[PDB]
């Protein structure tokens, strides 16, 4: 029932805060991620259409998308700092190194596209609702965020041809973000089994759904 401009405003408003690293490397990241997850859950409940879902459908979408949402946030924060990743304002970094290159490559992409914050909050919403829709209301909401994205592009004086092309190259990013997430959780699960640097309780539950 919301308009595009109401949709955008609602998402920039529910935007989670930028946390700091409580200052071993993966220990700091694990701790940082755990605190971000608490803010992410409350952000998800403020994403229009999410609360309308079954409580068991909510858990599931969060279980599938949490690292994607974390990684797209990191990529966004790292935009103005090429060659480096801004996990936290006080934690800026330069078998995870492969994932680092992909995250760096993704942030270079967003910078080269000059991704807008209003587009960012839409993409992050899409990730939450789509990354586990496979395994009719969500589609309608996904369609709404699509129209919302088009609106933003149009309002900036972008061609109808430019809109379809930008919308495409934006959604093709999510495929990489999905990839980086899948590879990330494969790595996190190894670190758990090898008992190096302990994952938090909530982070353990997020891992035991993959």
């Amino acid at each position: 029932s919301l308009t595009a401009d109401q949709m955008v405003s609602a998402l920039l408003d529910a935007e989670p805060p930028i946390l700091y690293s409580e200052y071993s490397m993966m220990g700091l990241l694990t701790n940082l991620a755990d605190r971000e997850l608490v803010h992410m859950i409350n952000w998800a409940k403020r994403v229009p259409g999410f609360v309308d879902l079954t409580l068991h459908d909510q858990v599931h979408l969060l279980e599938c998308a949490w690292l994607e949402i974390l990684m797209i946030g990191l990529v966004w924060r790292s935009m103005e700092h090429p060659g480096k990743l801004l996990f936290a304002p006080n934690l800026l970094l330069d078998g995870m190194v492969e994932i680092f290159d992909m995250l760096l490559a993704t942030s270079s992409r967003f910078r080269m596209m000059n991704l807008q914050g209003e587009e960012f909050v839409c993409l992050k919403s899409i990730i939450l609702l789509n990354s586990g829709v496979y395994t009719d209301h969500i589609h309608r909401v996904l369609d709404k965020i699509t129209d919302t994205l088009i609106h933003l592009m149009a309002k900036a004086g972008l061609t109808l041809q430019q809109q379809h092309q930008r919308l495409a190259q934006l959604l093709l990013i999510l495929s990489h973000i999905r990839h980086m997430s899948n590879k990330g959780m494969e790595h996190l699960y190894s670190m758990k089994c090898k008992n190096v640097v302990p994952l938090s309780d909530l982070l353990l539950e997020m891992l035991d759904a993959h």
Binding site: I41, L55, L202, E205, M206
Partner: peptide, 7 residues
């Protein structure tokens, strides 16, 4: 679960 609790 913890996830259901924070919801």
């Amino acid at each position: 679960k913890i996830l259901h609790r924070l919801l």
